[model samples]
Target: EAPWPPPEGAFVGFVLSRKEPMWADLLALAAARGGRVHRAPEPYKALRDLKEARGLLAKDLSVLALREGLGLPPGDDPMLLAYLLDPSNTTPEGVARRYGGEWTEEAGERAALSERLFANLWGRLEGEERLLWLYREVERPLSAVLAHMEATGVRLDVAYLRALSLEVAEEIARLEAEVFRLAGHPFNLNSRDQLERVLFDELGLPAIGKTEKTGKRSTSAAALEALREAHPIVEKILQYRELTKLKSTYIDPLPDLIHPRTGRLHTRFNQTATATGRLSSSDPNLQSIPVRTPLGQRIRRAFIAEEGWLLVALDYSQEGLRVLAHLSGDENLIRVFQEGRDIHTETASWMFGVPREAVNPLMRRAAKTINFGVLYGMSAHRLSQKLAIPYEEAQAFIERYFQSFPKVRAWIEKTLEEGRRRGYVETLFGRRRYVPDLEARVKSVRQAAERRAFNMPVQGTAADLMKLAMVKLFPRLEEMGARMLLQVHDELVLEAPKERAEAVARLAKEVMEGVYPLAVPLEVEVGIGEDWLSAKEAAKLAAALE
Candidate 1:
């Protein structure tokens, strides 16, 4: 072996080629504690390769030697450096070109290229202290969190999914039959063209919208949703479509992804994937699992904890609006949360001119829509479509919403003007999202950029806070013999000992709720159960007991 692990202070780099026996050890050594490693592309891939090849859990490897399993440390990753500097240009070839180096195929040349790339990127980051702080403090440590989540994948109840598949299959067939009966003819229900003709020509239903790409009468889910009251066939067809999608997207494809050795579904968590600093997972995206349907709940029931363990899920309640309350400094909005009043009910009482006691679910529902929609800079027309109300009524509702909360309106104006002046916006943690098109010539393009400007601060801060919580919670969970398996947006799922489940739930809730302080309190709802679906119900019970 040529000089086993690189000497201290010696530059190390590798292409993740697994041919050599020592390559894994050398890479792991560097990632754990060895200094000054360089890689032109993905260091995450190397970490993953080590896990797959060694047949070891990240937790297992940590037991063998925790330092080694602690995950990818602060190595000179030129790719990540490039990503931090300009998220748009992260490809190896792009970074090389940007830094005045030609892309090379040879291993030695690439290593030399990364050395140059790292120096240049490091120089840029050094000039900007805040950006450097974000890179070092937030992004760097998060790689370890993501790696462990991928390695210690969640257990799947494959047999439950198989049974659910049959249940869903029968429901889909029933819906198809009902749709055919209502249509008075059986056509290709999957064909958009056929469906369009049936709805508009054969059935004489109004054309609600048109396709953007082809300019044909739209049969999209949105358009169909708007036409739900138009014909009974529409509802049946929608049900049929939803069931078939559930069967295909989640129900059928999930079991095949279970790892052979672990018999668990290992989703790849991507760190640098989004412009807003949020994490996304692939290889069966957990986020795509719908939360509002009975079918969705049934599918979630298949995600069971390991034999002797229980699953605990903790979710942030109305995190975005709470972030808005802090960022906007709107006293009324903050007061709603501070007093523990239901925000939607209070907003409805104010906007619709009703007492708090008189704000029914209908008014509260409308308030809820406008509350979240404001974050996206939603227009009256979009609001009208969403609420199925007239354009004028939606416009007046928006005006009343602003009138009810003047400081929020002022904050929106100030944030937009600031974004125009700075050409970018920063989250609470100084994570920057550049909006180059804020002043674009086209109306729609500029509006889209403005939407991004409005949304980024709230969404990005939420993402940053969640990440901070994960970083703080990871080691504590390890100490408690628990491991975080999934982070789907605002929720985290962990597996813990059956006896320790309640404590784990309490720990998660405490850590997440106390992770940050805002003008309004940060609340985390906790749940504990044997499977994912039961966690939802347990959350209510958990809160009651608390």
Candidate 2:
């Protein structure tokens, strides 16, 4: 009678809508088994009518709406609790686990409950063919994908990561000591209060802005940059903070969390972690590792090839900007990429009304900031803040940039207009991300959403492309007898036998470059090292020399 064969032995189950005694017993069972329960408040008479209860459950479209329509608050919402516990679940079984307490208990109860619940629900939905379709087609497929993703455990490089941590710690300590000497005082590097005293009282630096909630002066790079010329210690403090973060976040804690048996840390990738479908990692967040600074680059070096292997580093060159050009159909921007010309150089030439060879480093730096900032909806105020230039000068620079690239200006305007009308934006691969607040009446909220709308499509698409590369590259590495150790955003780190290092690097480059085809060619930067840091140094030296 059904297209999908009744979901292969599925059944429906039901519980009393408002039997306090029965509910209490269920709760006790859940607790004893280390489970949890989420409930919704029903209108007094709704629960008394089986027809109404059944209809409500059958008609609800989104889990979020189902909870709200059923009068559930945050604490009592089953969907919310399920999302909180493990957002990875796409089934009623996943929801059942919260009530069952522990994993083992949850698995047992979930299976039993799902069978009964499905059978009971089937009987209630006998007349409603659409409800059956919803369950069998939509819910079933989504749940299967959720379960599948949860099972695809990612590998990590534990030994190399541990060595990386020690290196980061030493660097952090060195930076901290240098900062203290520069400040002319010994202070607790971790304590904001001590930092505040060193910056504000001892050094007598003017406060730029205070952090929200904490009401403490912001010690971010921007804040320090404002005072860098005035106080020598500001730069040192900024460096210290950067090094400390590198040490504590990536180096110190990574090895401690690696799986002992596998010797590889398994970073759990969360699909729904971002509002967009772009994945995020936890336990050992491979995404946050840095690549720009010398110390940060060292973190990549820590990700070495395993014994008999080599590490390959591959990244997209100006991917987001290129995506912008493609999506906007900005001919000039596309031409710059197509010609393989220096984008920043082109931008500098355009903005300054100078020849590409005549544009100095300062102009190029400003051009670089403008290039990235435009995608984020940068205003004259933001540009002024970024470049420490007068607001008027920043405004002129921005105006000149738009004048030189009129198509880019038109593209930005049209993209935002489309997002406002459609309420969402789609990437090249058709991944859609909704901009919920795009139409907000308030300027600030709407502007913020607009910025996100522009960024989501580009950044999210890049993330998807990288994921595609990984999926292709991961298996090929195995086939070639190499191992993927870590993924830091655009870069993939691998460890392989020394003998196959060249082959692995070649394969890695091919997979990464072939991940996504575009108007412009994708480029990769590769390196080799005994350890992660050493490999990183080799890569940096190579890049600098080139």
Candidate 3:
């Protein structure tokens, strides 16, 4: 009909008009350039919408290619391949680096060789068939999932976020001043070097650890916590650092980025960003907000229900532990969740060889730390450093933990073995994560790799589960006319019409719990608040409402 370059301005105007055929033709042209064009079934005529088509293409193509064409290396999975090849590269970048040899010198030689190979392979019957098969089978299917994610955009709570930012800014200023006063001098709260100088040089605090390269004293949480009793400034610095991060990262920037028309912020959930296939949020990373600290908790308060709407927050109780139990098939751990007993208490009892009732807060707390730490391959030395306990005591406690939950220990060993052999691991779901550094000669590097190998599957699976839940939940919210405003890790915050609060809550719970269908059922705790903080409080209030 029209020449290949059918006017760029024409397609733009057609897209703006929401015209279907024109957009379809435009997509076809682009796909043709890639030597493949997907034809939708007749029933999905409305799928010609550019946004929807983009999603479909991403799902069908990118994800398919990832899962099938470039199948994970058997001994070392693709995730590990990607990571070890270039620990810092994005998934696609990692793929490119691996296939293209762009990560090292002799780039020119590699490029020429690659070009020659491509030329030699092109149009060869087998090569062509293989490429087409990869596109049709793998890439296309994965594109559909990615498409769904793209279409199911994240919602943001702008007003509450703005107010929260201001509140955080004021608190940060106060904390900064207090920290400076406590240090008996002015200092940049943001600069780690400046803070280190104040903590070590001016204050004369004993340096607990040093960085590998710089050898400058590390001013991290562990160091500050160690010196807390020695100086008020240490505590102040810690507090100051926490508050500053909350203010700048979550509270302050979130409001400015809110879409004026929607009066909400839309965070992009990157499906392919993490090697572990863990979805990450950007444009106000809701996942990064601090929930444990009071100052950090205030950032949550900044997220509020829209006018005549209620906000719902749902958090999975002991998600990681549950995941560990499910993956490990540890009877004791599974029994705790199935019996609805307190996990930490159960763990404490097992570790101390006592009844659950005899497990006190201190025992439970130690159990809690150890339980969480085990997923990351925590060592006795690290545990000792964390709890200020003797190395021997930490080692004993760790041994006791394994003895009590032998299956978990077995699972860890098996996971490491698989990682060592395969170079990656997979969650219960098909999401894959690579950890290539496990083969490193350096102990630290290998240990870190082992930690990643141990943790990525569980964490990444949880992440995928959350994303799948969000995708399912977003449409239901829209159908119910409720607005989703934020996603903080496993928790989804929604703004709903007052009358729809109960309905929305029920739907959220059902969708979240049902999303993954794990061996142990997933549980959601939801609440509503005037702002993010209040919403979290409301979730606690609404626990019984569910």
Candidate 4:
């Protein structure tokens, strides 16, 4: 076997979590006893501590060796692993039958698997230095940091949640009524089966697609969008879906998840969830907490800090664009961010040959859409679909951007070629994301890989930089008596004493923007309020704090 993963070798584990309530404190406190982790038991607290040390890392080295069984299901959820079970298990309690369990039960198994996986990553993968560094220095440390963050949890204003509940119930009922009237009849609005009838049968709108499984006409959101020009019913159906989605995803269930012990909602942050290495939140996904609509913004107001503490939200400004500037080293793009001009306005000005300040919202909107689409492959038709612009103009809009930033086009082509050559794209932090489809014989497959190749380096670098920020910021805030409660895309939500909230904001700004030295400035916006929605102003809040 390849001798990679330079094993820290003597990783320990415990049979159970820090169950002996006193034991948890002892474990952390044990570190002060004049001994390194590998040089264990000689510095043991007691005989039982030595006995406990035997199982400490029997399998896994990382902190995921958890389960006092508090994370278990209410009932024995055998069906959860039904598919993973082997039909060949003829005997009761065979090795094959011993396979899967939740986080706790599977901790030992996961530890072994993780060790083996690490070996492969550093061995035949031949990126031992870079990939191992990513896992050890970046990913492993952040996992625990994120775990503590989830455990610390965020306080929720139940009264506001209740108010939003009532408001959403009213709006949902109103939308349902408006929907049926437009459909010319009443039916199960919840059922896509029923809506498919109203749309394709009664309304006679052109069928947009067929479901892959059932092969029936799709009444999905995309189809509804296609039928938008066909009838007013489509518009109402879209509105109905939006309202129902809000109620189901957030309004109805969030209050129930609030922990009775802590009076806060704990969101599980999955370190290994996304392909781009971005953390995903669930068990009440605060990441998807909406901000687009009035109701959505009002809904966010329920995410409150403790009585005197304030929720300080720090968001990276135009991070994706900044990442592109750094990755591409596009002089024009770098200057825009470094010069601290309104980026969307500046891009619009560059495209339209107008003064930067003169680029109106309409122009900026088009430029924003164009900028986003450029990082991924987008067609003129797709660009036109994104805005109220002609196909030719959309094509011209993109062409003009390339004309202004020629180095950007060259950098993208080079990035795409690198993916095709090496079967991966490496981020600013040297994290490799393989895009094997770049070498596919099929044109569509190759094109999709090209798009992913373009997207991965820019977007993945942004995620890498953000995580590095979190990794560095983790203890700094702790020292200052602040708690990081949640992380959304490009943003971290924290709570500190009102007196220290300003200090937290300043600390967060320096750590996040300074984490990775990009070619351009990585600007961060900071704000604070009692609730999430109110903490949106950077300048005004900064002034207030002063």
Candidate 5:
């Protein structure tokens, strides 16, 4: 009496609910397999349900919920199509209302509405060849990769995190005792009023800033950091805040989030969340974990592979800067990347008029700071503040950098002008970000838009490259019996059988580097170990896990 398997070549729409098996819910599988399907109302809910029901757990999705980017076959999803047309407005009901259709709560009706929406959306894409190709070739397949990564979550050493929580708790207690000793008494550390009294009235530390909402002296991080040298209590408070945050945000909560069936921590990758087209993860965002600090490293050490499996981590080196060099066509930047010279050192040499060999660590640090700062269209005042240098010196350093990379200077000017003219900025891959703020009446808004104009193409293209690399890497990982565990910023972490770790790392390097043909070569650093930290550090071998 009902269409169990949708008719061949039929355009079907479906809906799915969380916490239910697709088979148990008859309507959930209404468009099972046979047809050219438009995604479910909330496609991720449907996809995850399908994965759980059909035992199709694997790796990936999001470039930020490039919701349409999920790689379902025949690739026509109405929500995604709506995104492509007007990214700002993408609700199913919104799309239906935009086109004069009433979208209701019923599952059967929603499927039918999605079918009509798809037909209407296809008319727009049918003529737009480049947009369609980007969707089909890049985003469409990426969704499955994100879904699989979500389903096949990273293994956590729950015992290790529990121990770390105790250690962090001890540290917090020590910090509290130290703060009490410094303040002469223990007031409620959580109370801003108490903190302000201890810092300003008791300690006699000058207020650095005031809170806008409360019109009170700010006891914020910036205020505390500014007053670190002013009083001993400030350092203790900062340390206490850091440890408590680490304990509460990650150490304690993570164990509860582990999936019972998989015995791993699964994070939800979102597409269409960020303006720059980069994927973001939530439900305990793996990306939020700090990497540089010792405590952060300890947290990472808790992310271990199973007994026989080894962890492989691959991260792009100076990816955003490389993207900048490619887009700017700056010969100085291009030559440095092409010759494989250390970019920061080379930049130091260029800025200081010194030989590459004579670029000291101090000089290189300045170069590194400004190199990244430039991507954000950093002001000389901000550079001066960051480098703790004179305003004139910072300004001169920037001018020297511009002299060395004239094309980069020109490119920024060109991008800003074009952005103002077109009311949008676009990535190298044709992903356009509409920026009405470029023409905003306010000075701050326009300035912010200018910074965004300088940044979008570089950062957005880097995102495009990452997504493309993931799409390219997934099939190969499957072939090698390796699974992509997590993607955090510019790095991809994977799990593979002991024998396959090296082979998979090599394969990942090749796939990521060759994902796009840029003006300069992309470089990937590979590591292998028993845990995420060891893999990232490349110190411990895979044998250590066993």
Candidate 6:
């Protein structure tokens, strides 16, 4: 009964609604023979290359039906009788009367409009073969894949969150009083205006940073951290801000979004949301969930499976660097991953000429920052500011890195050069991102694309593969009666019955690492525990998360 593949040759049209749950509702509707789908605003394709599209307007198809040379064959499906229009927007009854004609109901009128729109726009791509390939291969499949994920919502631990939010709320109240006592008076420690006045004007603390637009001395968290040594009040103020934010942004409200009827949280998965082809989560954004902070980890603990299931998190350790290694073909980079060595430690040992075991925390920290920094467009000045190393030291360290892995230098330059020439850069799997800034007359604008080029292949190739894996993995998981719950960065979270945890882990690892073969071995580390944090805890141990 599923309204898919549409009797092979039946012409199909898509109608989209911006309404919440509309996406999932449409998907569910599409499952039965009476509904429609097959997305035409293929926006990622349209944004890059194609503009041909869909929406239900039947009259346009009626016009095409009259032309002798229109190349129209009656659609083969017995159900190819009419076009679908948004019931919320209009009905066949209303549309037919405006023109003073018969309608087969109003769908007959809209069906022509929809068909004409498709034929006219789709004709513009007459023979641009590569653009067609991008449309059919990437965007076409990805749209349906994302729809399924949004429809199949994730499970949340509501009882745990109720308790967790209370604990965080109590701590915040305690911090608020302590912050007021230290300041010698009560002020809205939450307000930038009040904090700026209290710290700089009242207490006469050293001015460190300023807001970009206002040019006023800032009281942002970074500013507070920078001045922590100047005032005991600064630490308390920071804690007050942290706890309040944990309550307001995360702790207090995440549970309210749970479906009252279903008891699950459905975060919409946005495909084609970012320019990089990366997926985003919204409603309650699980993707942006903070994993490093103690409170943040507690929030993650509230992301758990049901009574007989386990949450399994499988992460691709040093995924971006592994990508850098394969793409750059650098000897040192390849040697590290191929040998399954700790990439950060290996980097520190080589960069500092220290024995692998003897590399101190400071040295390894510097090496790790640079390795991750390579995944993006970062310069010594930028790196120095972020990692807080001396400018000369950051520059010198980078020079040493370039010397040791000269081809990595080549990789960066070559990727940027391709962006300049092609007006776009593509990933390993032909997911192309057009960077128009490369064509800008201004030097700064062009350099923006140049910098992005450094990260594109490294980050984009991973996104491409991960997405492909998702498309392939979803149905398989359903077959196994396990579900993929979330995807964050280079990691995947899923739940399977306790008896099937080991089996699902094996399948997930195999699919994630094997779906797209790279020049080097693709590695995935799998862990299982009662909740997300516990499952991810082993990854922290293995990589030594800060």
The residue ranges of model 6 lying beyond 4 angstroms of the native Cα positions read 1-18, 22-138, 386-390, 438-447, 538-546
Kindly give the number of clashing pairs for every candidate: 0, 29, 32, 6, 24, 16
- Could you give candidate 1's per-residue lDDT for residues 347-393 as a string of tens digits? 99998898999998889999999999889875899899878999999
How would the candidate models be sorted by TM-score, starting from the highest? 5, 1, 4, 6, 3, 2
lDDT of 2 by residue, 228-336 (tens): 8767677667767787777777767766654433344445444345644455655556677666787776665555444554555555668788777777777788899
> Residue 386's C-alpha lDDT in candidate 4?
82
Name the lDDT value of residue 301 in candidate 3: 61
Number of clashes found in candidate 4: 6
On residues 463-489, what C-alpha lDDT tens digit does candidate 3 reach at each position? 667766766676687689876655555
TM-score of each candidate structure, all chains considered together: 0.86, 0.68, 0.73, 0.79, 0.87, 0.78
What RMSD does model 3 have? 8.9
Q: Which stretches of candidate 3 lie over 4 Å from their true place?
A: 1-189, 544-546
- The candidate 6 region of ten consecutive residues with least summed lDDT is 78-87
**Model 1, runs deviating above 4 Å:** 1-5, 9-76, 89-94, 97-110, 177-187, 201-204, 388-395, 544-546
User: Candidate 6 on 1-546: residue-level lDDT in tens?
Assistant: 232232222233322243344222221111111233333233122111211113332112211222211222222111111111111113333433432333332222333444444344355445746545544554445554454455456678888889988888788878888877877898786788988888889889877888979999988877778778767788888777777887798877888877654567767665434556576677768898767788888888888787899887888777788888888889888988777788889889978999899999988888888888766655788789877879998899888888878888888888878887887777665556666686679977876667776666678778777777776777788798887878886888888999998899889889888977676778888888888888888655654432
| Tens-digit lDDT track of model 4 for 191-248 | 9999888878887888978886999998888766766875777877787788788888
lDDT of 6 at 219: 86
Worst 10 residues of 1 by lDDT: 52-61
Give Cα distance to truth, residue 52, candidate 2, Å: 38
**Candidate with more favorable, higher lDDT: 1 or 6:** 1
Ten residues in a row with the worst lDDT in model 4?
72-81
Off by over 4 Å in 2: 1-105, 109-187, 197-204, 232-240, 528-530, 533-546
In angstroms, what RMSD does candidate 4 have relative to the true structure? 8.6
Best of the candidates, TM-score? 5
Model 5, global lDDT? 0.74
